[PDB]
DNA sequence: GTATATAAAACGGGTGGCGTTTTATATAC
């Protein structure tokens, strides 16, 4: 082994606590998009940490694109400050990470059909529909996308340890189904 | 486009329970 998964995307939610006028928000922000007809939220962005926020009239906000939990909270506080600077009585509350995505490379090809047959109740593999095997782990409850190349995607985690836990648990199985 | 996780909530549609839609990301067909 020796491989440890790399975090790729962190999704979080934040309650600003006050109602927002989206045209005002979009108008005053330096990096905003807002087309009511397409989606009901201002799509705001900041350069550091590089992230994207979906800002709603209710004052709720979704922050995505961060590569670390630190970066997620940091960028979230920053978006909240922007809203304040524009003039609303916003508050940075209820910061919570909802989804963590990770990925790695085991460095060997995998026999997906064998794995799907062996771990049938957790696996779903339809190569004509999507080339990767969808593995639904029980403990921890994580979803893994397994590819012939040996590249692995882990998602559905609320905490970093779950990403790490799942990979540790899957590695022996990937080894059992290697090609070379 | 296909598939995976996840929140936010307005829209469409017919006056309603709920599917779609958007955003970010790895991955590969």
UniProtKB/Swiss-Prot annotation:
GO cellular component terms, semicolon-separated: nucleoplasm; nucleus; protein-containing complex; transcription factor TFIIA complex; transcription factor TFIID complex; transcription factor TFIIIB complex; transcription regulator complex
Subcellular locations according to the entry: Nucleus
Record keywords, A-Z: DNA-binding, Nucleus, Repeat, Transcription
Single biological process term from Gene Ontology: regulation of transcription by RNA polymerase III
Primary location: nucleus
Domain of life: Eukaryota
Disulfide bond sites: none
GO molecular function: chromatin binding; disordered domain specific binding; DNA binding, bending; DNA-binding transcription factor binding; RNA polymerase I general transcription initiation factor binding; RNA polymerase II core promoter sequence-specific DNA binding; RNA polymerase II general transcription initiation factor activity; RNA polymerase II-specific DNA-binding transcription factor binding
Sequence repeats: 7-83, 97-174
Subunit (UniProt): Binds DNA as monomer. The 1.2 MDa TFIID complex is composed of TATA binding protein (TBP) and the 14 TBP-associated factors. One copy of each TAF1, TAF2, TAF3, TAF7, TAF8, TAF11, TAF13, two copies of each TAF4, TAF5, TAF6, TAF9, TAF10, TAF12, and three copies of TAF14. Interacts with TFC8.
Function summary: General transcription factor that functions at the core of the DNA-binding general transcription factor complex TFIID. Binding of TFIID to a promoter (with or without TATA element) is the initial step in preinitiation complex (PIC) formation. TFIID plays a key role in the regulation of gene expression by RNA polymerase II through different activities such as transcription activator interaction, core promoter recognition and selectivity, TFIIA and TFIIB interaction, chromatin modification (histone acetylation by TAF1), facilitation of DNA opening and initiation of transcription.
Family per record: Belongs to the TBP family.
Protein name (database record): TATA-box-binding protein
Taxonomic placement: Eukaryota, Fungi, Dikarya, Ascomycota, Saccharomycotina
Gene field: SPT15
Shown residues within the full chain: 61 to 240 of 240
